[PDB]
Homo-oligomer: 459 residues x 4
Amino acid sequence: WTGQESLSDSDPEMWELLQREKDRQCRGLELIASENFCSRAALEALGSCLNNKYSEGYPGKRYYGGAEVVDEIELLCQRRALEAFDLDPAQWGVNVQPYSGSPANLAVYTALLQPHDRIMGLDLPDGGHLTHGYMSDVKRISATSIFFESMPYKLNPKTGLIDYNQLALTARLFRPRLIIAGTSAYARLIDYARMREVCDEVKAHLLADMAHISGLVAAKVIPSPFKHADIVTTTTHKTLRGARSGLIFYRKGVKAPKTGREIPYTFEDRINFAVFPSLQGGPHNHAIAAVAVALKQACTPMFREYSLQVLKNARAMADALLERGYSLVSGGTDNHLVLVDLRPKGLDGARAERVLELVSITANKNTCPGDRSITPGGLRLGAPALTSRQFREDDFRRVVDFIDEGVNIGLEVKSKTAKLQDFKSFLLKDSETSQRLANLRQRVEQFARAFPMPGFDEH
Amino acid sequence: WTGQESLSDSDPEMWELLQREKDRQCRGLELIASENFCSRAALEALGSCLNNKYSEGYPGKRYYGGAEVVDEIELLCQRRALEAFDLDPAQWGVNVQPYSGSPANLAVYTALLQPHDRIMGLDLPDGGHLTHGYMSDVKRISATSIFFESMPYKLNPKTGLIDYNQLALTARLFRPRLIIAGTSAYARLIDYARMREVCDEVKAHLLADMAHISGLVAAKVIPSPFKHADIVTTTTHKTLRGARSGLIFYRKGVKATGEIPYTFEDRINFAVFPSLQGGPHNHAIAAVAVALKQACTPMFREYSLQVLKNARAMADALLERGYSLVSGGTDNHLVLVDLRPKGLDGARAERVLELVSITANKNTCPGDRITPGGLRLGAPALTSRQFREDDFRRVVDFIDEGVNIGLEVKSKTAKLQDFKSFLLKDSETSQRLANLRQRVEQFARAFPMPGFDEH
Amino acid sequence: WTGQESLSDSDPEMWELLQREKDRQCRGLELIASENFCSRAALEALGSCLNNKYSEGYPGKRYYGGAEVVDEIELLCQRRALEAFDLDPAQWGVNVQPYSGSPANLAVYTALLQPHDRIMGLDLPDGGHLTHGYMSDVKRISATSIFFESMPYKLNPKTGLIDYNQLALTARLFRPRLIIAGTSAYARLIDYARMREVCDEVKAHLLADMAHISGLVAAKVIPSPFKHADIVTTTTHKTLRGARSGLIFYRKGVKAPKTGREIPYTFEDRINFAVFPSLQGGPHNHAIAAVAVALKQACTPMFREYSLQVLKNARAMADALLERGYSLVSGGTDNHLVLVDLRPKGLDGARAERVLELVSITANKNTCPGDRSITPGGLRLGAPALTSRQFREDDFRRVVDFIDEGVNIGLEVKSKTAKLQDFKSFLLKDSETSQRLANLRQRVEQFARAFPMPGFDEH
Amino acid sequence: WTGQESLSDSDPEMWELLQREKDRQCRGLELIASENFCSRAALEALGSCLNNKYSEGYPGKRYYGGAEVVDEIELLCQRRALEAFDLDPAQWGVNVQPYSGSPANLAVYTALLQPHDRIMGLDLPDGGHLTHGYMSDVKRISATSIFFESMPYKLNPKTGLIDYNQLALTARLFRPRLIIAGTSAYARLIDYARMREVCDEVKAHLLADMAHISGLVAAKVIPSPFKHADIVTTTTHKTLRGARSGLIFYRKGVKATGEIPYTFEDRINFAVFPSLQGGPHNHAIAAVAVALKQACTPMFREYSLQVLKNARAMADALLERGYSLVSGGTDNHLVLVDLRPKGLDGARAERVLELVSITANKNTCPGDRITPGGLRLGAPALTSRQFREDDFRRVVDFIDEGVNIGLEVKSKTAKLQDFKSFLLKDSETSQRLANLRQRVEQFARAFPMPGFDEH
Ligand SMILES: Nc1nc2ccn(CCCCc3ccc(C(=O)O)c(F)c3)c2c(=O)[nH]1
Ligand SMILES: Nc1nc2ccn(CCCCc3ccc(C(=O)O)c(F)c3)c2c(=O)[nH]1
Ligand SMILES: Cc1ncc(COP(=O)(O)O)c(CNCC(=O)O)c1O
Ligand SMILES: Cc1ncc(COP(=O)(O)O)c(CNCC(=O)O)c1O
Ligand SMILES: Cc1ncc(COP(=O)(O)O)c(CNCC(=O)O)c1O
Ligand SMILES: Cc1ncc(COP(=O)(O)O)c(CNCC(=O)O)c1O
């Protein structure tokens, strides 16, 4: 035994699963707005010897020795991160050690806030993420709501865009220490200048979690939150199309004074201390390297053309079913995802997702503003995944037809069934649907296989 | 742009940095006790298309859809995790989603304890890890000391072993809700039975963090903490020789008028997600599953047996050459060397050994508060390169030459950065270290290296 | 030395101060809404041998011995408390050990809530009290806001009455565990049925702090909060006209169930444990006795006539200066105090209070809804103090004339000065005012001395 | 209705209850160590018109108006408070607004510590007070254990004294921010210097809670904790013989490149008001000021001297009659009697002594966890009734008869409530206790009683 044996020779039971997952990725259509297909150059670094190196600390200030090479890789990842988002290395710094998106936000809270300090984020059913501070009415769900006190800001159930009105008044009542301007299911843009002026009034930190729109900000397509926020966290996958990791961007340098006083930003040393030694242990240098590869790809003109494509098909998604029997919350989209309101078409979110999944269309249910209730009303459909397969507008309008067909299968089964347990049932029971779904899935798998796919060929 | 371009073509700047680290690992003597060389089979899974799948939730209980095979992969990782440690699936469950060892420990605290509940682990300078609750006398350092109240227990400096007596004394006063049994720098076997009795007396959960000794535990070469702990966490690298990830083993079934069940499973799984983490790193979960099957093989038992032999051979070689060992020797994978009787501190030795491609780390000795005067040396990394007992005896020879080089420089320097700069500016000390480094690399390059050939 | 020597014989320096304070009490007019003049029967018990007894615990469940007599005094205080507010001793219990009003509320929070649990109270500048959870924008002021997380509910700056609208929406955002329906500077009534229905929606405890309107609820004049709240705290002075102490009323017995289930209230054992042994030590049995005396006086027809008088002069206060050059927030009063808005008369709160004090009219500045800012706009004027001196409507309309004269002295000095340091200055500097105030104070002291005064004659 | 009616006329039900307690105090032997008989002069101030004045704030810094003389009264109480303890007004300030001793301690924690900061006091069964942080093994009992994290230090059971060594050992591990020096049941003098060194080492505030010994400290008959503590709290009753209220003494001026000042004054005063309390009990503040001037007199020094003599006379009388004393004897105002060697527990003795008008309280002995087997007896209450050494020797005689009555009943009963009921139902034990009670009351009534005659 040497450890250099191939995976296909040593673990065939596993190797069959990697290929089965790779096949299904190429089999169907990925419409989850948070998913994407990583490049072979990044995964080549992800599965490298950099997994073997323990490099606790930071470049130049390690605790072990022998970090000569990983120090240059971390510094290059930092330079490529500041370059990808057009940041002066004197006005901004970046921490590339967060294991994923969730640890990145928890590190920002630990660095700048005390336990049980106040936090305001967009609620989870209103398009927010768990790590933005989510409690139900029974249990504290996210750990961000256990170690800190979180009050959600909602948004106008008629506008579809976040209620910067109600956020302003309640920020003066709740008196938060930090407000998160980030979204997980929101098809429009964020007024970060509005978010900064409410934060400056109640004196709260404005943290931007551009996790979903990271690649779009990098390609300078949509307005960048770095002009208004002081701290920016993000995912390294999603639109950035990299390995699973996180990044914490923080403002650095002099912020502002009598006739003689320099008043510097204090984010850097606190943020870096929260990541290590407070929260995380040994960095995942293989992930940091894979992120640096994906960040370099984000500085290229290819990535701007890819980013400019995720919107035009997001609009093509919005136009294709607005010109069908569907309405969209907020009234379309200005980013990468569409929030199709299946309520005015007599459908629910849990209904369509199970149907679309069985025909190899991966989606997820979303709670639209006028949804009520487990059976939400709306679906979450994204662009960046198929756009990385060289999908164009005509290709996305055809998927909408594949979706519309799947919806009208569910809408036909729903009127022939009752509850959700009977609906998700009859999707696999009724023989009239047992091969109507198979006939569809057949047409859907052949349409999807013909497109290219980033990464390795067989895994 | 297809996204299928190779790394050497697409990003030549990063491809070379990859190969530079590969050469550094192949040419150096990796003695960091927490480092190992992951197999190529696992790395193939680590850098696969499983990075692309968002599967928030658990097998069968996924929030989204399309996780058909990812559910099979995570379930396979769990089955191999319990098999690797001879665990009854009816008495033990495992969470395979912790991003690393530090998240695994934070998930256990968030699941079982309320904020500011009390935690007891071995003090960091005494051999405990950061995530076992560590505060300095000036600052709360570990987040385990911010969200929870930690009080450390200490070694008996006379013997270098854990002071199980003083732990029992202070646990009755501190009344902790959870006590951590697990070390980062400890050459001896933890008395898990004694820890269990202390936890039973003060009504505390016993958490075993076997991150450093997990591979040894899986190979049944040292006593298993599963026979005494309710919760067991571990890293998946180190002696398990896998990708970087975490595991949380917990008790299941009935604990003990009349059926008091265990209440760990769903609290632990809820703390991992949705409380603390987001999407699981399915590529890491798969690479861990590949490593876990390797841990069930007879090959891994003989390797773990060799790790113990190599550590003792390294320990015996140091003793015969006039070195002091904390706690007198070792019973696991690492060796704690006390360099104070030889005349050099761990800081100076760590820098000298690093410049000759020998990677160790300074280690606090019982007594010092002070610059560290010890050194922690591990066997599992080089043992994966087919090192044997005679090879580690030769490693101690290279270490002994490095110590005396640092000894002669200390006599020619005052402050520590005068010492560090003297190893670079001074022309002799430069070439004297260049000859030792070359002899070290020629000796290390000859041994095989797990993983890919080029990166 | 025996300890039985008189105070006038053993401590003449002190004895002179007791008489000086007694003289000034009879000298001037007490218009502080929270103050009152205690009866001689209560103070006789307040300065008794009951100060010597340590009786930690509760009747029947003491920790020491020899509590045979104080147990009957505590039980009688409990019976007289439930009788004074017409409570079924099966539906309500009372804890008579709170040292004062502030400890009473802190005990309720400790009993029912966890540290950093959420609390909603009326803000201090909006008429609330400190113990209702008051933070500034720099420091956490009240300890209730340090050990618990408090978000204030404000009230319509045009209505004058608490904004049950904004309280309802923010209670669904803040998700509090307990909401306090109590006031310190609020001239109108509280819709406790509105307060209960918002508490039932967000599932929060409704605590009523009737500290200011305790005597009015006891005399069954104004609506009682005990019909809507589960926990009621109060002061034993203020309108109850007793010694300084506090009381915690809690609901007791079965609250509600399948076909067989009794679901009891759990307030009693928690509330009693928070008072002792959690927060307080040895009870002040001399205060408990003095409270029981004052509570028995509250069950009498005399107290209803006294209570019915505190409002008619509160209205007479409201009418007298509404029919002068003054406006009142909320538009008058329905309880015992008036909140005179001195803004539309060109006056401030800090201006009039210092002027009225120097002529022996004790008042306090209050922040009216349209006040801005240290120099608030409005004054807090109460009835129960002088009403206990057998004051009637014609007597209160004359004080308003004494007030109006004092205001027009300040309004004349304010136009002759500038800031507050110069205003409070020229009140004692200008000789035209140095005896205009002395001539007034002379007429004010003779008008006030002629009225009776509860308590001892000389101290 | 004028409000000037007497209590005997207005409320005859309460007036009689007042006189019933007065007779119980005059006829009983008050041995509760924390009880004293307040003078009539102070009670006149306690039940005065100062109950009517709301003066939220501090002298000169009042939020309202009309506190002209109340400011003079509070300032006079402060001047007498520092004079009573020989304190330089430039080095010490005092807050006279704490409603009692428990609020005084909570105000110190709220002022100096953040929520969940760490507190160390002597354990309750070992002689510490509730407000020094007390949790059982099942529940946080004291609010000082809810808003802050308390860990107790313990007596050395071999000697009955505070284990200053183990306190130093556990303070280094627990790292408390404030350590409390002060007891409720402790017959010996606290080593405030040793407490100070432990606090200086772990960077903790030393809080001295002298509630039980304040009168002795004021009379300079025992060492003053002000020579070693930064914060000193006390009740105003007990040995100070005043009304029920609290005091917080704190350091002022300069504490120690170059003028590091003390930072207690405004933090302490802010915690009292507006943080914790509302309107001060000016009637209590005045009654306290009357008592504080009494504490500065030569009369109070001779009374405090007699308190020590009476406690030793009580202690010696118990020893000669075959009783055991925790820590061998006493150096202050109380005596801790161990009744386990005699064959009776404190619970049974406390009930028997109560039925014969002898008021003591059961007290845990070092070792027991168990029903208490000891008894705490205090001297300051009866010493205020002009009791002398021979009178306390007679008190021990009455106690000795009560113990043997309880001993014979224990031999005729099984459970504890069988014992308690036997003292009431059984006709002999009833009349045997009636004869002792009558002899106790005839002996006690003869001594003078401070306060009013009738109430
Ligand atoms: N025994 C043991 N050894 C090692 C070697 C690496 N690590 C974790 C990395 C050390 C980080 C650190 C160490 C000490 C301090 C301090 O402030 O003194 C600190 F602020 C941060 C450990 C460990 O956690 N424990
Ligand atoms: N040494 C000392 N003696 C006395 C005598 C009275 N008090 C305070 C009243 C005791 C309340 C108490 C005591 C014990 C427990 C327990 O749970 O064991 C409890 F839940 C409540 C004290 C004191 O605080 N300390
Ligand atoms: C016992 C123990 N537990 C948890 C962790 C955290 O695991 P990650 O670093 O993978 O998060 C470590 C890291 N090991 C520290 C060392 O090198 O000694 C550890 O040694
Ligand atoms: C806005 C946002 N922020 C943070 C995270 C956390 O990232 P990790 O799960 O990699 O830790 C997510 C994941 N969101 C998943 C989804 O929307 O489907 C996210 O959408
Ligand atoms: C040392 C000490 N500190 C504070 C307090 C609290 O004081 P109040 O009870 O006045 O709040 C007490 C009460 N004494 C308890 C006993 O009888 O032993 C005490 O003994
Ligand atoms: C509504 C209310 N509640 C509680 C308290 C506290 O009571 P003590 O101060 O007796 O603890 C006050 C005192 N309020 C004083 C004022 O309004 O002037 C109050 O007005």
